[PDB]
Amino acid sequence: SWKRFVTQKRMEHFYLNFYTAEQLVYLSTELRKQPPSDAALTMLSFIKSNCTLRDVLRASVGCGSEAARYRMRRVMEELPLMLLSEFSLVDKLRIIMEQSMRCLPAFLPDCLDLETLGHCLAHLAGMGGSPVERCLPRGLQVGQPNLVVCGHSEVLPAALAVYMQTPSQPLPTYDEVLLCTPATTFEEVALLLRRCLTLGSLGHKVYSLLFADQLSYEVARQAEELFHNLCTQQHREDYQLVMVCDGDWEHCYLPSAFSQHKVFVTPQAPLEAIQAYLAGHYRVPKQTLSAAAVFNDRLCVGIVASERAGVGKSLYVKRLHDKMKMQLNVKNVPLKTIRLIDPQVDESRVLGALLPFLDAQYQKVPVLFHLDVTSSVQTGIWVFLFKLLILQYLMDINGKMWLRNPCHLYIVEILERRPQFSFLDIFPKVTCRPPKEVIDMERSDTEPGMDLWEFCSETFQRPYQYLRRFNQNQDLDTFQYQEGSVEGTPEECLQHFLFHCGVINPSWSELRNFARFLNYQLRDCEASLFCNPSFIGDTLRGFKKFVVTFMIFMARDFATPSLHPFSLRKRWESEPHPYVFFNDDHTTMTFIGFHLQPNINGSVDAISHLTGKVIKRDVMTRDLYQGLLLQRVPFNVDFDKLPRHKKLERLCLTLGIPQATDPDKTYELTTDNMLKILAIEMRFRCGIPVIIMGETGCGKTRLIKFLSDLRRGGTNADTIKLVKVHGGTTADMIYSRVREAENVAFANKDQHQLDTILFFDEANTTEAISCIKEVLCDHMVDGQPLAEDSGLHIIAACNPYRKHSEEMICRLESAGLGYRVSMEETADRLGSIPLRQLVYRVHALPPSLIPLVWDFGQLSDVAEKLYIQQIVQRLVESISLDENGTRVITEVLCASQGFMRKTEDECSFVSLRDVERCVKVFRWFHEHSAMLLAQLNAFLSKSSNHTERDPVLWSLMLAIGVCYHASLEKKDSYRKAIARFFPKPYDDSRLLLDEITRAQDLFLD
């Protein structure tokens, strides 16, 4: 009965169709209040723009007819008699229901009935401006349900064309247009159709139902039925309706039910026409104080896009914010940054992040909403931007609504997702171009170039001055960069950096990192004596020139990309690592990764410490080499042959650590480990993010822990937070861990003067890798800037992008009854590759990280054997087994790992964790070796010698049977390969198999 009542009241009052059941309840409970919630006022603004309490009041007069109040009085008088006239609870309940449907305000005095609400809404509408008079384009018959079919790429602009016929009229909203989706409910479509057909309106408006093919079967059927019913009853005969669908889905329910109404003249408009339309409808009057006053013809909506990453979108938004703070002459201008991370845009989260700004203090104050559409977002962008920028609205299932205010400036930072034209082209677009294009093409705020705050910054100036005096072969000995000084032009700086960057078409991020490295190095130089007219005299000549020529190479190592559908790796060992540091003491200089050798040419060259091959030549002159030798600078050192404590001292010196305490005597401080530690520390110092790619077990966690402990010096303090990222990891979790790490770093820095390290293990195993990109590159958390001067350092670990062998893939597809889904129907995939065919379940890397990722290196057989020996010795320390047993275990486990590595058709992943697991199994069997062997002898005696068994070898055989044997299908080959390392008579595969089988039989017995 109440559903029929609401349908009748909607047919009676037209504006009740602007809102749903819950929204109507909210308005009923809120309109009577004083003042109504800002949310309700916004919801009403979709009828009477800029609705205020005064307007709601002026509309509230005339609604309370004393006829309705007379109904209220007679109800409040009769209801008790009607109740006592009945005795059955059900009868009283029915009477109460009926009397509430007749007069609700009697029961609920703090609420408005549907009649009063409809009247108030109609009054508000009349209190508004002139109505909207839209005329359908040609090919669409007024009074008929014009069905337009087209391509997805044209579904949105087509609708737009329908509303450009009358461009003078304002842009539509949810009242007219509805972007259908599979989750769209019948209520929204019903309200749309009722608004289209029901009578009571004050103008002629078009009503569009876009992507109708996406509506569910039930919803489409209900919409058709409701449309027919509305057509039967009293309605609008000149109703302008459009129904757009995807030609690829013209076979669904709704496009079919109106197939007879299909239209062949699909509306279309030139991109320039749409541009002018949207621009004129976004332009803010000079009198309306808006954030748009500083954006491209006073436009309230903008797009900052780029073909690639690291080009200046967020920087453009920041400079805009600064321009607004400086121009509008207001003390504060909010800047709300919204990061979209979900692959499918979640409009609910954006609406929640926006709601706080519905307050009245913001409805007339400039604001800058910075919507960042990350690379993770794949579907839902066009619909979202159409809803928020053209339809200027957002909504949720609850009922809350958000309206786009012209006083606010919406800026979308999106990477071009490359029809005749792209969607984003319709909006006012600012295309940020990289340096190469910036120097080739070139002022125009639509095509920005090289910022001035950066060009005038030390980071870009000191390297620039040095390189400028370098290419001109000027005397760098006397030159000294003056703080704040500025020279040259952005063009020369760009040219020099591109010449020395080591990259063909770099981004602004790569160039910034190169500049930061060079600047940090040259500054740590100038702070020393070697490059000073005093403390030496003229002993060191060309020192600055050598420093530059070598730091360019160091930066080629620290900045050039290491990654190049799934092809992403170059390697770590294939590249040298010539590192030169200026120690914090300002007295010593550390050299590592290369050896300086003179030659016949009276020059000096850098050669690999391992191969002796030349890395680069003419790095310096023989005179400078001899001078630095006189200065006792370490050259051609072999850190591998040094003592442990000497290595620790040199390392803590380079890192500026004064103490030299070894926190872990087991960690081998080979040259490569120290080089990696120094790379991380340099990236921390110069400000470059640290994103490391390495297999599990390559030694990254251990290295990071060692570095943290070493910088600790023993001081008890949680200076490291190791967050293990998994598929279930979310953005909020990452932000929370980052904030916790920030607080901890503040505490540690103000107590012990230490630096905290937040490490992300397996970062690329979640869809929230964009949050990590923000924490590292953007230096922000959920839109909030990370507090500098916190001593916090972030590290990210990304697993490799590998694919199982075709043989292993076929073996898995053939397991059991095979995968329930096919490799074609799988929704989980990294583009075209199903995630189930990758070794590591990883997700695409944000483009801004790929140039930063580098390889930690694959564990060499030597390191594998050393770690295995360490594990077996740690075991011996408890089980107390002889040396022969240790040797046998080490050999058998190394051989097992080698076999599983060779067997790329059965195993594509090998790590030390499997070794630890096999050791744990061996220990378990050893502890139970006595009882197990006794029961085994008993079980063998029952069913039929003794053949005494060594508990160690027996346990090891069972452990190999559990870990490797069982999983394998080539068990015979594995046994043949592994028995060689077994003592006698256990060097026979058949004996391994027999012992495994006997243990299994015992267990099953």
Ligand SMILES: Nc1ncnc2c1ncn2[C@@H]1O[C@H](COP(=O)(O)OP(=O)(O)OP(=O)(O)O)[C@@H](O)[C@H]1O
């Ligand atoms: N003229 C410039 N344009 C852009 N960036 C510059 C410029 N000069 C220096 N930089 C540095 O380059 C970096 C550019 O980062 P930016 O915020 O533009 O990335 P982005 O455009 O958001 O890319 P993505 O959205 O893919 O991360 C900044 O950290 C900035 O310090």
Ligand SMILES: [Mg+2]
């Ligand atoms: Mg950005």
